[PDB]
Design a protein around this ligand. Structure first.
Ligand code: HEM
Ligand SMILES: C[As](C)(=O)[O-]
Ligand SMILES: C[As](C)(=O)[O-]
Ligand SMILES: [Ca+2]
Ligand SMILES: [Ca+2]
Ligand SMILES: [Fe+3]
Ligand SMILES: [Fe+3]
Ligand SMILES: [Fe+3]
Ligand SMILES: [Zn+2]
Ligand SMILES: [Zn+2]
Ligand SMILES: [Zn+2]
Ligand SMILES: [Zn+2]
Ligand SMILES: [Zn+2]
Ligand SMILES: [Zn+2]
Ligand SMILES: [Zn+2]
Length: 319
């Protein structure tokens, strides 16, 4: 199909997305960059979708975190998310798509701006949210591995799928974990969707980049970086350590698993056979330019190898 302006897409119904794409690319993403708003919007896709529990309720990827923001944004685990919700609200008001669709669309658009990134499958047609998420559904950085795997499992994700989804932390920072140093990234390349995150989480911790007693924070190996206690544990726990290490310098796996699992998350609470596939409106992501590697002055002796079956891979070091 050919839309009013000459752009094409497989299903004509997808045409309404093109002006929305242009609007968000300039006005939310600072001109199609992989920056702060991309990161927050990708976080938002998760804090929307994971509000889903067979026992407790919540409609999943339904736009509830916008529609019921007054409730959801005051949950402790949602600290800091009010900023991006308030930034997305005017676009949702202005355009003719549901908040659930908008959140997933903005997340997939944003991720496509990141070198090494992926086009997450996107489906159009979610109805407006009809309930707030229950509290206590979003994993927290001071939660155990057992707790996180049980929560994500409750929502339908296996342990390997949790690791795959945490490739998100390759383009991410924290603002509230240590509010003395807001905006500190989880890897040395927060504007590149790469395996740096899985390498750097495996390094021996050395320092706290800000203050030293924050709940849910572990030592970081690098002054410009913050480490979550949840990521420290997942990189090391016998349940997840071997999958974690398998991501290192495995960019094809990161891409293919992240996109597939994000699609599954984007569809929590929904039914893709009632939705329309609009994946071809999402832009083509830029490529990686070079290999993930150790930071300057590090070596493999700085890696806390945690997988019994398989030696951590050789890596070069930024010299
Ligand atoms: C599995 C358990 C997870 C835990 C415990 C966790 C925890 C956290 C924490 C504490 C922050 C920083 C919040 C702040 O202080 O500003 C954060 C940021 C973020 N998370 Fe995770 N998260 C998890 C899974 C996920 C998943 C599945 C996604 C997939 C979309 C995701 C995407 C992000 C992004 C992109 C950021 C950066 C936000 C920003 O830069 O402002 N997270 N997460
Ligand atoms: C039950 As919980 C994910 O708030 O520790
Ligand atoms: C004290 As809790 C179950 O919200 O991690
Ligand atoms: Ca929701
Ligand atoms: Ca990165
Ligand atoms: Fe509201
Ligand atoms: Fe913030
Ligand atoms: Fe580097
Ligand atoms: Zn900006
Ligand atoms: Zn922000
Ligand atoms: Zn519009
Ligand atoms: Zn809780
Ligand atoms: Zn908790
Ligand atoms: Zn942020
Ligand atoms: Zn364990």
């Amino acid at each position: 199909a050919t839309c009013d302006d000459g752009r094409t897409t497989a299903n004509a119904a997808c045409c309404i997305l093109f002006p929305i794409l242009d609007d968000i690319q300039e006005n939310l993403f600072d001109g199609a960059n992989c920056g702060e708003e991309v990161h927050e919007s990708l976080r938002l896709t998760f804090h929307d979708a994971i509000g889903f529990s067979p026992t407790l309720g919540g409609g999943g990827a339904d736009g509830s975190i916008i529609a019921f923001d007054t409730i959801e944004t005051n949950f402790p685990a949602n600290a800091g998310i009010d900023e991006i919700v308030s930034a997305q609200k005017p676009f949702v008001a202005k355009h003719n798509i549901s908040a659930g669709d908008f959140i997933q669309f903005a997340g997939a658009v944003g991720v496509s701006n990141c070198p090494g990134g992926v086009r997450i499958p996107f489906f159009l047609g979610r109805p407006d949210a009809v309930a707030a998420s229950p509290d206590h559904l979003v994993p927290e950085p001071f939660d155990s591995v057992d707790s996180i795997l049980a929560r994500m499992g409750d929502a339908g994700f296996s342990p390997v799928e949790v690791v795959w989804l945490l490739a998100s932390h390759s383009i991410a920072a924290a603002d509230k974990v240590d509010p003395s140093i807001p905006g500190t990234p989880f890897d040395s390349t927060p504007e590149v969707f790469d395996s740096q995150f899985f390498i750097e989480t495996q390094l021996k911790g050395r320092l706290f980049p800000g203050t030293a007693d924050n709940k849910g924070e572990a030592q970081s190996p690098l002054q410009g970086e913050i480490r979550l206690q949840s990521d420290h544990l997942l990189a090391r726990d016998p349940q997840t350590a071997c999958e974690w290490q398998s991501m290192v310098n495995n960019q094809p796996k990161i891409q293919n698993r992240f996109a597939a699992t994000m699609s599954k998350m984007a569809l929590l609470g929904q039914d893709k056979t009632k939705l329309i596939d609009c994946s071809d409106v999402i832009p083509t992501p830029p490529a990686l330019v070079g290999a993930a590697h150790l930071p300057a002055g590090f070596s493999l002796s700085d890696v806390e190898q945690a997988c019994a079956a398989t030696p951590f891979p050789a890596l070069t070091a930024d010299p």
